[PDB]
Design a protein around this ligand. Structure first.
Ligand code: 5FB
Length: 226
């Protein structure tokens, strides 16, 4: 079941679907040290990210190989966008989970180096647009489909998924110099989104040593689930 029928109708059925498959709020707390708590939380975010992707209409239409290639290239973007998303109502704070909210200094003390600052930069870029939840899920799905993995074997198939999600965003906006410009403004945050994800990976790999090899960790979980 590839859920392709959701691309046929008015977009509101697709949006309703994205809203439903949005992961449940996680609780990071039960007493572990900050680093350990975040590590445990991270493992759960990885699994949730993978299950989320598989429920994105049209994703399953891609060859198994391309699904994995797409996921390996943007999983951090999806994850990071979730963090930014939970942080929007706050000021200069990061809601890693319902019950785990850190300011810049708290992030630094939790082993995140300067990621606190980098993540808040992303958060501020999104807060400036005052996202609604519908825009976030559409943008997130689009970020998944806008992967630029070097290992994609059917590039037009990925192109078509990306196009369909972009058109969904447009149709959603149109139905709330085209003022539906609203869509472009969301798209213009995608470069910072990708950069932020790269920054997170660089921090855990060290600079490129491999202290905390998240790509391997992700792959192992990916192939265990797919
Ligand atoms: C210090 O924070 C992390 C620790 C780990 C585990 C590592 S660190 C090491 O020394 N040993 C390992 O196993 C993994 C990832 C962490 O960062 C996050 C945790 C949770 C979320 C969410 N929601 C986002 C992040 C980020 F990656 F966006 F920073």
């Amino acid at each position: 079941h590839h859920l392709e029928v959701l691309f046929q109708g008015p977009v509101n059925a697709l949006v309703s679907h994205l809203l439903v498959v949005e992961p449940e709020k996680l609780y990071a707390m039960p007493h572990l040290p900050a680093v350990a708590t975040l590590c445990d939380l991270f493992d759960r975010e990885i699994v949730v990210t993978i299950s989320w992707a598989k429920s994105i209409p049209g994703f399953s239409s891609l060859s198994l190989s391309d699904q994995m290639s797409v996921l390996q290239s943007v999983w951090m973007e999806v994850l990071v966008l979730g963090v930014a998303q939970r942080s929007l109502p706050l000021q200069d704070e990061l809601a890693f989970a319902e019950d785990l909210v850190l300011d810049e200094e708290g992030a630094r003390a939790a082993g995140l180096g300067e990621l606190g600052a980098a993540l808040l930069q992303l958060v501020r870029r999104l807060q400036a647009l005052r996202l609604e939840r519908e825009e976030y899920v559409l943008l997130k799905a689009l970020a998944l489909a806008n992967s630029d993995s070097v290992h994609i074997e059917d590039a037009e198939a990925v192109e078509q998924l990306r196009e369909a999600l972009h058109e969904a965003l447009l149709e959603y906006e149109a139905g709330r110099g085209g003022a539906e410009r609203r869509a472009g403004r969301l798209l213009l945050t995608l470069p910072l989104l990708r950069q932020t994800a790269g920054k997170v990976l660089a921090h855990f790999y060290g600079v490129l040593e491999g202290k905390v090899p998240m790509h391997k960790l992700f792959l192992e979980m990916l192939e265990a689930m797919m």
